[PDB]
From a paper:
This uses α-helical barrel (αHB) peptide assemblies, which comprise 5 or more α helices arranged around central channels. The αHBs present interesting de novo scaffolds because of their stability, controllable oligomeric states and lumen sizes, robustness to mutation, and the potential to functionalize the internal channels for small-molecule binding and catalysis by incorporating both proteinogenic and noncanonical amino acids.
Finally, we used analytical ultracentrifugation to confirm that the oligomeric states of the barrels with bound ligand matched those observed by crystallography. Using ultrafast spectroscopy, we demonstrate that the channels of heptameric and octameric peptide assemblies are long enough to encapsulate both dyes simultaneously, and wide enough to juxtapose them for efficient energy transfer on picosecond time scales. Analysis of these data yielded FRET time constants of 0.98 ± 0.2 ns for the heptamer and 1.3 ± 0.2 ns for the octamer. These are well within the length of the hydrophobic channels at ∼4.6 nm and demonstrate successful encapsulation of both DPH and Nile red within the same barrel. For the octamer, we observed a broad global minimum at 4.1 Å and a shallower minimum around 20 Å. We also tested the octamer in this reaction, although docking predicted that its channel should be too wide for precise anthracene π-stacking. Consistent with this, while the octamer did promote the conversion, the loss of anthracene fluorescence signal was linear, slower than with the heptamer, and similar to the controls.
Numbering used by the authors:
A (entry chain A), B (entry chain B), C (entry chain A), D (entry chain B), E (entry chain A), F (entry chain B), ...: 102 to 131
The structure:
Amino acid sequence: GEIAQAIKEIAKAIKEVAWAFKEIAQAIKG
Amino acid sequence: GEIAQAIKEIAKAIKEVAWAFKEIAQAIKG
Amino acid sequence: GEIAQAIKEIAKAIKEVAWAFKEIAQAIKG
Amino acid sequence: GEIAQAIKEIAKAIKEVAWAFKEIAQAIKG
Amino acid sequence: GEIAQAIKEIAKAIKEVAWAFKEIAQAIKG
Amino acid sequence: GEIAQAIKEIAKAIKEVAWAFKEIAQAIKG
Amino acid sequence: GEIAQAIKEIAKAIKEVAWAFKEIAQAIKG
Amino acid sequence: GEIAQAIKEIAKAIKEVAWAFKEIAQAIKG
Amino acid sequence: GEIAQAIKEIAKAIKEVAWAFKEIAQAIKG
Amino acid sequence: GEIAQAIKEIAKAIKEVAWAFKEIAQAIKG
Amino acid sequence: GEIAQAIKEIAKAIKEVAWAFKEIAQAIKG
Amino acid sequence: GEIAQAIKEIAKAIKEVAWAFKEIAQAIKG
Amino acid sequence: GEIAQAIKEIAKAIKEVAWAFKEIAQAIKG
Amino acid sequence: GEIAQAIKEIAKAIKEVAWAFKEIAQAIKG
Amino acid sequence: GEIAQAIKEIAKAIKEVAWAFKEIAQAIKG
Amino acid sequence: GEIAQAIKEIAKAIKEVAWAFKEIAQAIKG
């Protein structure tokens, strides 16, 4: 579905945001 | 349904955001 | 409902995020 | 309705996010 | 509307989050 | 419509979140 | 569309939030 | 569709949020 | 709700259609 | 919910349409 | 809203269907 | 689901309408 | 709106159906 | 999904309406 | 969009219903 | 899409109904 695929793109973008926060955790620990 | 499955994918991505913030908290605590 | 339950899963994930921010508040105070 | 009730649950979860950020602000102020 | 009012509750919660970030700005400046 | 008006209210609230983050950036710069 | 335009306003607000985070990155580097 | 296109715009904006957080992580690492 | 009231207007119109069919039943019997 | 209640009102109106058609069938049979 | 206005247009069209069926009933009665 | 069950009630009402048309077919044949 | 315009097309088609029933009323009277 | 399954149930009911009208046509032809 | 395109398909089908009723009116007139 | 395909199934069923009305026009003319 068109709308379902677009909603899945938001989840993929939020996963990108979660990965960036893991880098900040690596930055604080470093 | 694909719509509810896509909405569930956003919730799973937000959970990964919560996991990365817990890694940040441990990085500040250490 | 299928869609309603999926939306509730997002709220549960946001609650997880709020709990992680409370750990960061505990980390800054510590 | 279950849909509007589920949407209300997201708003309640975001309010808890605002509460945790106020705890962070007090942690920086102290 | 039921759904419209629930969506407005999310906006009110996000406004609460924005106010909490203003406290963090006051905390960093202090 | 009330639905689109409610969605517009979320966008206005997110804009206030962006404003508070700009206040944080100025607090770090000062 | 009325609803589509309101959803686009949320994306524009999130882009504003992303720009504010870039200022915080400039603040930390400075 | 304009609705799915608008939802895609939110995902693109969240991706820019992830990019700005990666810039923050590099600012802490440097 | 705006949308709910408009949907109720369709049901009222269908009830008008059902009443017209009752007149046709009266016309055939007469 | 008001939306599902409004959709239920359409189903009730269509049932009245079925009742009027049964009155027509009895008018032809008599 | 344009959506509720469009739904209202369907109800108005169904009302015209009820009007034409009342004209049929008068045609059988005469 | 609340909305899904209400939509199923419309299908059940349309099935009632189809059964009434079968009576009219029995009335014409009789 | 794309969806609103498509819904309006259904109302226009129902108006066409109502006009055809007026011809049947003219046919029975003739 | 339950929503699409419910919409499919309406289409199945409308098909039964078409079947009953074909029985009417055979009743007029005989 | 596929949703609005599907809604347009219903309007096209209802137009064919209006065409068949005009054929009925000509069958009664002849 | 799941929902779009289900909506298209309704249009196909309405086309079946329009074809049945053409048989009734053939029945009246015959």
